[PDB]
Each structure stands twice: as C-alpha cells, then as structure tokens.
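Consider the following assembly input.
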Amino acid sequence: GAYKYIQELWRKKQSDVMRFLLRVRCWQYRQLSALHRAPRPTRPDKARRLGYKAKQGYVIYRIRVRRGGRKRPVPKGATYGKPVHHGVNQLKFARSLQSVAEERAGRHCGALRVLNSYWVGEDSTYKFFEVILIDP
Amino acid sequence: YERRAMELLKVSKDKRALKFIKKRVGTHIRAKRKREELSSVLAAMRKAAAK
Amino acid sequence: MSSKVSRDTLYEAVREVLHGNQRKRRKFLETVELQISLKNYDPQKDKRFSGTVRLKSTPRPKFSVCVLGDQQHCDEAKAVDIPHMDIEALKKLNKNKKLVKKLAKKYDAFLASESLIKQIPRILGPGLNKAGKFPSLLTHNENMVAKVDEVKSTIKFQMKKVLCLAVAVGHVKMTDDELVYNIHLAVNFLVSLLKKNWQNVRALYIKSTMGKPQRLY
Amino acid sequence: VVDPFSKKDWYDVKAPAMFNIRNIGKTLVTRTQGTKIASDGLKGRVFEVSLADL
Amino acid sequence: KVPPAINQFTQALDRQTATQLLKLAHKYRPETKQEKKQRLLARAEKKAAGKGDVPTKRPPVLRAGVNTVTTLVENKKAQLVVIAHDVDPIELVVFLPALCRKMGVPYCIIKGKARLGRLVHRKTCTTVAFTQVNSEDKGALAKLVEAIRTNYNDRYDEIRRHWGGNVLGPKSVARIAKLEKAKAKELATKLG
RNA sequence: CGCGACCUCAGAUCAGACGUGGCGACCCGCUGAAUUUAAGCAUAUUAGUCAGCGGAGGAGAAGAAACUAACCAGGAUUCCCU
RNA sequence: GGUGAAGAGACAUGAGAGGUGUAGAAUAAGUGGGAGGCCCCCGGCGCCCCCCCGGUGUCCCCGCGAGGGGCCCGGGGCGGGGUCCGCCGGCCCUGCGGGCCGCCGGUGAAAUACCACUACUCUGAUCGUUUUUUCACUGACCCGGUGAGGCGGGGGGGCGAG
C-alpha cells in the first residue's frame, strides 16, 4: 500500500523536502495572500486520514500563522491591578496555533465549513498549516 | 541524534550513549529500548563490512 | 612457521565454532590450544581466573597427574601407577634437585587435597612453580574415586602476569564434536568472568597451531 | 616563532641594456603562501643604484 | 544539493527508447470513454447470444494508480514499471525505485506525467506498469526491458550514492575564474 | 520560433449557488479585572465572575473508554438524590 | 542555520613488521613450550591440467554427404608439473639432499635448537567522523534604486596607441 510508505515517510524526518517546499510558501504568502487556496492537498496521506475525498466540492486553504507567546495588549505594558496580574512578557495563549489558523481560514471564507487541518512546515517565526473545507 | 549515538557506541562508551539518548528523547524506558535498536544495527554494519 | 596473524574476526555462528579450526598439516602433533586478550585484563592485580573444565583427550603436551599423597592420593598414586613418596626428598618432578629429565613442566596438571594447601612444591616440587604459575592452590579436585578424571585431564583456567595460560580444545583428526563441547564447556566461565565490562568486540582466539592460530565467533 | 628568515630567497636584479653591468645584485622576499604573493609587493620597490657601481 | 533519493529522479530515459516504450503501450492502453459504453452495450446484447458478458477475458492492459502499481510490485507480479519524473509531492514516489531494487522488478524514469495521462483518458497518471503482455510482443518487451534494467537497476549502488545540484551560478563561475586564471598564469612568481 | 499536453496562476456584469446583519433568556470558544474578605497588605479571596469579542440552535456542548477500579468486579454521554 | 579551503585536535577503521640485557653461543622470537617443526622437494595416494573413446549415446556443419570434429556423461592409468588445498611412508620430520645458538644445563622475561594463542603502533596514511583557528562562498535573511533599461562571459569589431 502506497499510503503506508507515505505515512512512514512523513513519520520520519531529516530529509530536506520540507526546507525546499517551505520557502515555496513563505515567498508566495508574501507575493500573494498569507491565506490562499491550494489546488491539491500536499499530503494526500494526512488529508485522507483526517477525512477527505477528492470528490467535487472539497477545498483546501493553506494559511500562514505567526508564532510566539502572546504579549498582553495594554498601553506601555504596565497593567493596573494587584501585582500578580502584572506580566506581559511570557504569557501563553490558550488555544493551539493550529486552532488559530483553522479559525482564521474559516472566518475568511464563509460558505465553506471546516473539517480539520494539519501541519506542513514551521520556519522560525511561523507555522504553515492547511485546512480542509467543505462546500456545504 | 541517532548518528551521534552510533558514533559513541562505535567508541563504545555505553553509559554515555545512554545519557545522550535519554537527554534527547526523555524516558529511561525509551532510551533503554532504543540503545538496543542502535546496537544490533551497528553490529549488522560491522558484520557486513568484515564480510 | 613464523606466522602469528589471525586477521579473521570471525563470525560464523555461536555453536558452529566446530567447523573452522581444522587447518591441518602438522605430521607432528598440533597443540590446538585456546587463549584470550589482555586489554582490560589485569594479569594479576584486580582480575584473575578460578574456572574449571574437563577435556577428553591428552594432547601432545603431557597432561597426566601423579603424586602427591595427602591421604587418598597415596592410594591414587599406587593405583595410577606412579611411585609415591611423602616428603623424603623433593626429587620426583622438580627442576633443580630432580630424578629424571623430561619436559620442564614434566606434566601439565597436579591437583591438591586437604591437609595443607602449599604442599605441592614441597611434595613433588616445582615446574609450573618455576614458570611462575601456581598448581598448589585452587585445583578444585580431590579425586579419591576418579582416575579417568585425570587421564582425561580435568583442568582449569588461571591467571598469569606474562600473558596468560593456553588450554587445548582438541585436535583436528579427532572430530569437531569434541571441539564444540570443549570450547562451550571451557569458555562459558571465561565469558562470565571476562564479559562484565569488556564486551567482546574482538574474539576469543584458538591457538590452532601449525602456522595459523585463529579465532571464531 | 618560526625563524622569520626561513622562506625569503634572493630574487635577482637587472639594469637597462644601456648600462655596463646587468647583474647588479639580489634581494630577499617570501613566496606565495598566504595573501601576500611575492611579486605583488615586489613591484613598486625601488633601489639606489649609482654610476659608481654600474 | 538535492539528496540521493531526489537526484535519482534526473537520469531519465533516452527519448527514442521512451518512444519505443510508448508505441508499445499505445497498443495496450485501457478502454477510454465512448469505447467503454459501446463495448459494454454490445456485451449486454451478446448476453442473449451466450457469447459475452461483463465477466469474460480481458487481454493484458495497463495498471495506472500508485496504490495498484505498488501492490503488484510488492507481490512481484510486475514485469515493467514506468515512472513519471515530475510529480508534485516527490514523496509520492521517492520510495518506489528502492522497492523495485528490493524485488528485482524492472523500472524506468520517463519524462512528463502528461504522457502517462495521455496513455489513458485521464490527464495524468503517476506510474504505469506492464504485468504481462501478449506473447507475440513479449520479445519486443524484453529487449526494452533489458535496455532499461541495464541502466536503472544494476547500478542502484551509484544511484543511491548519487548527489546533485550544488552547481554554482555562472556569475560566480566567472568571478572565481578570474582569480584561478590569475594564479595559474602568474604561478612560480618567486624564484621558487 | 510553431503546435500540443500537464502544471502552476490570473480576469470576467460568464452559468448556477452561498456568507455577512439582528436577537440574545439558555449554549459554545476566547479575553477577563476591582471594589469586597483576611479586622493592616502583596500570595490567596472576590473569580475564571461583571464588563469586552467571536458563533449558533430549538435546544447547544457532550457521547460510545488510551475509563473506572482492585472487587466474586464494573462498562458511552448527560440530569437528580447521594 | 547553509558551502568550500587551509592550519591546531581526538579517534574508530586500516594494508606491513617487531635484534640485539641484568644469569649464556646467536634474538637463547610481545608469548605459549615442540629435546626435536620437516616450510612435506616428497612413492604417490585424496588427486587438477593431455592422450586413451564404453553410450560411435550429444551434434554445431544440416539442407545431403564427411570428418577437422566442439562437446556432456562415465571409464580399467600422475604419458607429464607436483608443498598449486591437503591424510599415510622414509630420512638427520633433511642445522649435514636448503633451513633454524639445543627450549629442558644460565633458577630467568613465559627462556625461544619449535608449534607460537598476543599485539607495543606508526604502516599508505589512505579513509571517515568530530572539536577548534581563521579565510573566503551565497541560496534563506536584510538593505537600497528604478517605469526593475545595456549584468557576467565571449566574439565581429572600429579607433588609435606601442
């Protein structure tokens, strides 16, 4: 079964195809949108495993997200209150970067309903997710 | 990380190879079970080279 | 022949170690012996041998036993056909105040009993003593009802500071069924007492004589 | 360190043909080993050669 | 530098050899549209004549999809495998040549997925494979099979050892050629 | 050059479809403080609460075990007594 | 987050070997013991390479001879070289049909007229891997400028110069 081989391959790492084809997205999300449609699920392994069929009506949008902590947004960073509620450096958001990406793509494309997402690359200050979407 | 541990088993200091695998993968169970797979492959290498 | 090189590694099988030692020409007798390295093997200080073994056949070296006495071995001597003497003069098999002149060891094994444990060089005398090995303590035998034991030469492993002992695993003419049992009954204790830290990367070498002593995994 | 006079050799000197001595003398320098190839720093040197020896 | 398992994808076949391969295939292509329907309808009408239905012999034909090709390769029912070289995610068939090396199945790297697509009604097909062929064409197969396997299977050692790319751009080629010309020209500068 | 495929990627008052916006009693995901309490006060408490944002439905989320257990064993989810 | 090149470094591999002292005649061979190893020149047998043709059963020629015949079986003999691997015999298991003070007599290193288990590393240092030293490389990254306008190689080449 070919998909067994593909699965084992993605499970393994330390081959450069990731480095080759991550720039193919970092450049194009800055040439064209940071949120754009792809014409084929780059990992027909993982798309099908999550639940996908290339029957007409199925879309994937590949989307970039910027990674880091989450600095608490207040003016000049000194938050009024008792001093356990200070602190704006090391705060950590309460949802998976995958989830942030999923919701970004979903809110951008109405009339398309999410089904799941998965990871395709992670440069140094980014994460390159892609989202499977149904045309209901 | 596998190749480095293989070289350290080449020089044959297993009590350092284990520490290297542990400090990178995390659990002594996994390090113990993984040094065995790193051996029995290094062994195959030497055995099929002297062949 | 002036060859000492065992360039082999050598892996064939764990129990097939009987099918590769048979490099025979010697029309004299070939002492197909056995030994092992010295690296991480301290000749005297912290590591040494006490293990036991029993061969089937006496090789070219004289593997026979005789007196001492130290009772039940007076009867063993009179039964195994050697003149027996307690202390009268240390002239049975010595190297300086002797009676006859054969090979410096004059034999390759002499056991003990339980009146005292340093009386071997005082009863029959030196030999291995003069060679720096000690056949007086740690013999692991009393043999009051076993003479076939000594004529099959029940023997041991024991340290030495030069390199080591060297103990025979059979001959080529005799079958390899002999060699397989002999190696796997001798070096099991060697593997126990030398594979604790030294992981056996190199091999245990067979002094397969006539110009090609070798090794086998 | 290594004796600095190690790899300096006596490159030859020559006059115009219109003079009366052509092998004037010699001058030491090291060869190509680093980033200071000899002839590069050799061109631009200038001597003091007089009629009273040439 | 591309890795070995990617650089294997650049020693594709010789054009005329590929042309014999394709002219062979075009007598073997599967049934396309408006042929399927007519053959099946005629077969339905042959049912009343007891001479043909849906279940009846089909002469050997192509096997297109990657899953099917890999299945029959790992069952060793393949006599020839073709591989389009430009596939979108290379991980689709990066492993395949190694599989063919493991099981001694002849395999070749052709240019274009479009040609394999034209070998059916579809637009593209990652691989195709002959399992068996008509005996009269078996020899014509076997000659090309030998030509292929001479170059792609027996030298799996050098193929997997191969590296690629790493070819410096012409601007820098000339830029280094300047200094190499300078050093080659003026060498032996000192009386050494 | 020219032709023809596949791939990428475009515009269109092209053909047919669809989403935003409101209400918010209940539901879901985030953010989320201070009065106040400790007789003072900062850890704690008030509280994952009011305020803020996003998203729906007739109910929503849950749900068929990477579970409880330690027994002579139970056996998805929710709700009430305990 | 990459590349090369050189210098300082560790090491795994890796083809080639081991002379001389404190007791005696050699080196009395890292060591084990053989008072006798043969390095087996060796009758030659176990037996390889010609002839000899039982199945003149195989048949290239073939398509029909006619045989050079190539062949596969299997064969009562070394026609001839023989340590081409290796079991008996004879001899000083050849110091005297090579060859090697006698190990055991030097109280030694385990003694070495001999089989010889090991390796001290220096044997080409290939050949890999790794820590450092700098020098450079550009393809991610960043920087400017423009309506992204002659960039890097070359050549015709014309001008004159020497």
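The beta strands of chain E are 80-84, 107-110, 127-130. Ask yourself how this observation constrains the way the partners meet.
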